[PDB]
């Protein structure tokens with residue numbers, strides 16, 4: 798792919814984070830804490846899952862960024878509508894305002910309804926995310942495997958401003974403590 802020149806500098810919005818998340822001082826890394834991180838509750842925080850949004854809002858143009866997922870067992874990545882539900886249980890689907898992929902139990906799936914099996918020969922250490930607002934496209938690339946296509950959502954109905962979306966996943970196993978990191982341009 799030739800999307801690298803649409804690179805945007807993404808930072809994490811602390812106020813949207815689940816109360817157990819630790820966001821680095823530079824707002825470029827997030828990991829699951831082993832306890833509540835002593836922050837006040839607010840209506841923006843994801844209550845049920847270890848999720849957080851990027852600060853940046855997109856309503857036009859072409860945007861590209863990369864995320865490090867090294868040594869993680871579980872995560873969700875992509876983009877969501879600014880107005881997605883924060884409280885209670887929900888599924889990651891376009892109907893709910895999410896355009897995402899994930900790793901769970903040694904398989905990669907796209908967050909369609911129902912979910913779609915991905916075909917990945919080389920487990921990714923970094924994921925590229927491309928959004929074309931006007932075209933209605935969200936694409937995912939395997940940086941570890943020469944930027945090979947993972948998945949394309951086409952005919953997307955964003956229906957609002959988009960925010961980068963992140964889930965560091967739970968760490969019941971003690972093998973999923975590693976952070977998500979926004980990789981440098």
Ligand SMILES: CNS(=O)(=O)Cc1cc(C)on1
Pocket residue numbers: 891892896949950951952953954955
């Ligand atoms: C790639 N197919 S899609 O993203 O699910 C299309 C869609 C459905 C709704 C709702 O908003 N966009």
